[PDB]
Amino acid sequence: KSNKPIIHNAISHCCLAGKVNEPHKNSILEELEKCDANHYIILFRDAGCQFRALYCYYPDTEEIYKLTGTGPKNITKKMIDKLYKYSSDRKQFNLIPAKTMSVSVDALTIHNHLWQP
């Protein structure tokens, strides 16, 4: 199981779609092929779904490590606030209730004080 085609279905259509975002995503699609992980998570600031960064979270002790983008290096399971997924028919992001985070979760958001101004 893997999130990588679903993540490639996400940012190529929802987040990084844009002619100005096209040089930005070209550094990212090559980076996903280098990564050995199957489970890919996208970083967001608020519920407005603004593409911040992308993470490599796995439900085991594999790292949260920031793959590409601007964000903190380590994100703890306390730091998460809301869990995100993708709808292919909607091409938007739907809300998930609080649960054990795993492969079916596609993205997240984190705490506001964890952001720096």
């Binding site: 085609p5 679903i6 279905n9 292919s88 028919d89 909607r90 091409k91």
Partner: protein, 426 residues
């Protein structure tokens, strides 16, 4: 739980014209889109097939694909084109001329971006999708040429939905072009990769059913597709209508498919009788399973008494008792267990729908998965190996930009597909 029926080619636009003829007649709807039926069964499940517009007008959720207006001009000028919106009428000019490389690679790709935009405009209007439906021929240049480009892009977009097509197996008796086995092998090279399942439909087998079993004189393409639409709507409405064994097609996709590349089905229609034996025959559950086991009632030219059944689906319609169903299902397994695979004791899936058909008190639909499907696959490959050497009419596709080692890979995938059946035959 909604289904889009994207129809492609001169064949599949003619085939599905008979299909939505049945669907409007099944629910008792005026040809302009106005409901005049009286059942809540005909009222609740409209959402699956029809888009209700203002003024009780139903937009059929079905897409017509061709590179020529000519097939769609007759359907529009004829009946049941009035219920269709002009957004379903998407075409170009001119056609590919039964050419795969023109419909898939060079010229047919230009219309698909307009076609898949309508798919996105339809799927955003849909509340909940369950799977997308297609119908073409394997020798269809605009049917299968554009279609393999479609399913490759939709599976890229929608991995979670049922991706099936209704492809027509090319008959050796029915020959239009000589590069038809070229078109079939290049399709299966992508149809195994891109589709979740499909059926095996041969017109030559349907030629026998009209005359030997139904005693009909002149089988026309509408009369053939009238039987196919009885099998097309015989399967998918059981997902819609209630029953004791409500058989989802995605439930059916799990139970019938043991290996994701082994997804080829043998359809069959059970209540086949002529009007002379209408006064001679009683309609019982053992009577239909007698005709479900009948090789003459199969929609593909294969010998299931030569092959071995991987999985069997038994789609049923009518007010049936569970005792008569289960005991008759067991007795066929007691009789002909040698035509089954060894490592599964129950190779037959039962599917009873409580909602009876119109006119008939009982009806049923056979779906089988046998190892004799590779027999027609040898008919394509042996015709392919003769054509591949002498390169007859190859310069037409060579000017399109096709490579010969790409054809060998499609041949090797056909060589793989036969050998996959050989691993599970014996």
């Amino acid at each position: 739980r909604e289904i889009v029926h994207i129809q492609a080619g001169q064949c599949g636009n003619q085939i599905g014209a008979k299909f939505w003829e049945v669907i409007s007649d099944e629910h008792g709807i005026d040809p302009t889109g106005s409901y005049h039926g009286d059942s809540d069964l005909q009222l609740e499940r409209i959402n699956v097939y029809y888009n209700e517009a203002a003024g009780n007008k139903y937009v059929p959720r079905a897409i017509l694909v061709d590179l020529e207006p000519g097939t769609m001009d007759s359907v529009r000028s004829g009946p049941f084109g009035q219920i269709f919106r002009p957004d379903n009428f998407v075409f170009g000019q001119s056609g590919a001329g039964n050419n795969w490389a023109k419909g898939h690679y060079t010229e047919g790709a230009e219309l698909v971006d307009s076609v898949l935009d309508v798919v996105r405009k339809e799927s955003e209007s849909c509340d909940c999708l369950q799977g997308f439906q297609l119908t073409h021929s394997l020798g269809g240049g605009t049917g299968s040429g554009m279609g393999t480009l479609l399913i490759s892009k939709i599976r890229e977009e929608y991995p979670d939905r049922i991706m099936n097509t209704f492809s027509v197996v090319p008959s050796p008796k029915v020959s239009d072009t000589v590069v038809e086995p070229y078109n079939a092998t290049l399709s299966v090279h992508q149809l195994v990769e891109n589709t979740d399942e499909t059926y095996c439909i041969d017109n030559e087998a349907l030629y026998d059913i009209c005359f030997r079993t139904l005693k009909l004189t002149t089988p026309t393409y509408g009369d053939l597709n009238h039987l196919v639409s009885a099998t097309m709507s015989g399967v998918t409405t059981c997902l819609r209508f209630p029953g004791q064994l409500n058989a989802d097609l995605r439930k059916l996709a799990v139970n019938m498919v043991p290996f994701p590349r082994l997804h080829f089905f043998m359809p069959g229609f059970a209540p086949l009788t002529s009007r002379g034996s209408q006064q001679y025959r009683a309609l019982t559950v053992p009577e239909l399973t007698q005709q479900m086991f009948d090789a003459k009632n199969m929609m593909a030219a294969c010998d299931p008494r030569h092959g071995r059944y991987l999985t069997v689906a038994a789609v049923f319609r009518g007010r049936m008792s569970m005792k008569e169903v289960d005991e008759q299902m067991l007795n066929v397994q007691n009789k002909n267990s040698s035509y089954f695979v060894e490592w599964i004791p129950n190779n037959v899936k039962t599917a009873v729908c409580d909602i009876p058909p119109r006119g008939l008190k009982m009806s049923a639909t056979f779906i089988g998965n046998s190892t004799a499907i590779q027999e027609l696959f040898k008919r394509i490959s042996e015709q392919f190996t003769a054509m591949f050497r002498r390169k007859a009419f190859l310069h037409w596709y060579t000017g399109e930009g096709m490579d010969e080692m790409e054809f060998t890979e499609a041949e090797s995938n056909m060589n793989d597909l036969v050998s996959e059946y050989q691993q599970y035959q014996d």
